[PDB]
Amino acid sequence: QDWLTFQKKHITNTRDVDCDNILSTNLFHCKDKNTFIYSRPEPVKAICKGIIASKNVLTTSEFYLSDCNVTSRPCKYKLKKSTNKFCVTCENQAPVHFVGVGSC
């Protein structure tokens, strides 16, 4: 819902996200899945440069993605690493929402 919350929810400084640890916290509250982007903040914020009004944008470059997907056991996850483009909601030159992987 802003740049600061987007970073906390979707940016990681490690590709091997500890899903069972982080997803069990109050911010994620054991949700079914969450996608983390393994990258420095600048390359991610740059996706939205020049865009003022809310608009969904698909990245032109590929990024390292770390997905935490829930297993058959509640709040227990499997980490899936991949490289793909993603869709984000840009508002006032910064990503504020994560839409999805591969397409908008």
Swiss-Prot record:
Taxonomic superkingdom: Eukaryota
Provenance organism: Lithobates pipiens
Residue list for modification Pyrrolidone carboxylic acid: Q1
Keyword Protein transport listed: no
Role, per record: Basic protein with antiproliferative/cytotoxic activity against several tumor cell lines in vitro, as well as antitumor in vivo. It exhibits a ribonuclease-like activity against high molecular weight ribosomal RNA.
Protein name: Protein P-30
Uppermost EC category: hydrolase
InterPro entries: RNaseA (IPR001427), RNaseA-like_dom_sf (IPR036816), RNaseA_AS (IPR023411), RNaseA_domain (IPR023412)
E.C. number: 3.1.27.-
Pfam families: RnaseA
One GO BP annotation of this record: defense response to Gram-positive bacterium
Gene3D superfamilies: Ribonuclease A-like domain (3.10.130.10)
Family in the record: Belongs to the pancreatic ribonuclease family.
Keywords assigned by UniProt, alphabetized: Disulfide bond, Endonuclease, Hydrolase, Nuclease, Pyrrolidone carboxylic acid
